[PDB]
Write a protein that binds this ligand. Structure first.
Ligand code: NAP
Ligand code: FOL
Ligand code: MN
Ligand code: MN
Ligand code: MN
Length: 159
């Protein structure tokens, strides 16, 4: 099973200038809980944005060019990325925009954080078709001293 996990600001913005400009510790904790002990697939730009391997996860990087770091696994196509995960129950696709586009048609589950923040950005999560997806979990949180925007954790499953 393939799942996508992402945090979306208003208008599906996910990034600006190869960064995420907000800081929501509660959402990073949610990301860690839902990805730990699973393989994670990311594109090369997202790898450069994170800047280091994510511990406790098999890190698989998509790039058309040879890898430059043997602490992670480098693959050259979507099918190779999936194969490199082996026989696991759930593969997590962690972006960015171009990678989400390619894996969306193959995904059964979306883990989305909706952040109440207006962000100028240059990268968006794909338009998906709402009729294809059932919301199976949602949890709203007001802003607090640690998290400066309100946010909604949602899990959607392909109908
Ligand atoms: N808010 C969130 O949830 C979230 C999550 C992830 C990322 N982001 C943000 O998203 C932005 C990065 O997204 P992006 O769309 O620019 O880039 P991306 O999807 O991270 O990376 C694209 C790169 O991945 C490689 N790639 C993708 N598909 C491939 C394929 N089928 N075969 C081979 N290589 C492939 C290519 O690398 P080569 O050029 O080396 O071939 C391509 O240039 C940043 O702003 C980041 O902060 C946000
Ligand atoms: N909901 C969501 N939020 C995100 O921030 C997110 N980020 C990415 C890609 N970028 C990043 C950037 C940093 C870290 C990171 O530092 N993660 C630590 C945080 C642990 C914690 O704060 O408790 C990790 O070990 O996962 C992960 C992904 C992909 N999907 C996402 N999905
Ligand atoms: Mn092929
Ligand atoms: Mn197999
Ligand atoms: Mn806000």
């Amino acid at each position: 099973m393939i799942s996508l996990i992402a945090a979306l600001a208003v208008d599906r913005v996910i990034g600006m200038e190869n960064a995420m400009p907000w800081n929501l510790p509660a959402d990073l904790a949610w990301f860690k809980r839902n990805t730990l002990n699973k393989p994670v697939i990311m594109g090369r730009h997202t790898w450069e944005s994170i800047g280091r391997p994510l511990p406790g996860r098999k890190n698989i990087i998509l790039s058309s060019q040879p890898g430059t770091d043997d602490r992670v696994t480098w693959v050259k196509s979507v099918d190779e990325a999936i194969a490199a995960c082996g026989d696991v129950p759930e593969i997590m696709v962690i972006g960015g925009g171009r990678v989400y586009e390619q894996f969306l048609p193959k995904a059964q589950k979306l883990y989305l954080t909706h952040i109440d923040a207006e962000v100028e950005g240059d990268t968006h999560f794909p338009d998906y078709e709402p009729d294809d997806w059932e919301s199976v979990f949602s949890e709203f949180h007001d802003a607090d001293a640690q998290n400066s925007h309100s946010y909604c954790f949602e899990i959607l499953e392909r109908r």
